[PDB]
């Protein structure tokens, strides 16, 4: 019914790393780094792997910060996205054919050029809160309905 994905935010005291996706689903928007979890891999190992594939960065400990389920009306599969944060990385962000990473000051997060749900949950992430969300979309621009609640255990 739902397929596992990961999303990783590199969030430091004064800045966050986002990646401008160049191709495929969400192309043209800034977001964290993530993708599909593989056969035989834990969700956390998938999150670590996707961060390196998409940003060139190495993370050790990842912290669970959220779960968000996406529904696209007309599409059978739900995306079950496991969201993680880290403040501690190694390497320099690398630009590839798939992704252009840029640091942003926290008061300059480019919400108009991000998926619209991010305006709801990113501010929770900035204040070190944890959350469970559901967003029902029509196409990629319209939130038909949503729920979002803070939790103590992701
Ligand atoms: O921020 C949002 N808002 C709605 C949909 C999405 S899907 C983009 C994505 C791609 C691969 C893995 C995880 C994610 Cl979140 N992201």
Swiss-Prot record:
EC number annotated for this UniProt entry: 3.6.1.56, 3.6.1.-
Free-text comment on the cofactor: Binds 2 Mg(2+) ion per subunit.
Keywords: Cytoplasm, Hydrolase, Magnesium, Metal-binding, Mitochondrion, Nucleus, RNA-binding, Transit peptide
UniProt keyword annotation of RNA-binding present: yes
Phenotype for residue 153 to A: Reduces 2-oxo-dATPase and 8-oxo-dGTPase activities and increases thermolability
Mutagenesis / variant outcome for changing residue 118 to A/N: Mildly decreased 2-oxo-dATPase activity, nearly abolishes 8-oxo-dGTPase activity
Residue numbers binding 8-oxo-dGMP: 6, 21, 31, 115-118
Binding-site residues, O(6)-methyl-dGMP: 6, 21, 31, 115-118
Keyword Cytoplasm carried by entry: yes
InterPro entries: 8ODP, Nudix_hydrolase, NUDIX_hydrolase-like_dom_sf, NUDIX_hydrolase_CS, NUDIX_hydrolase_dom
Subunit-structure text: Monomer.
Name of this protein: Oxidized purine nucleoside triphosphate hydrolase
Organism, as annotated: Homo sapiens (Human)
Gene assigned in the entry: NUDT1
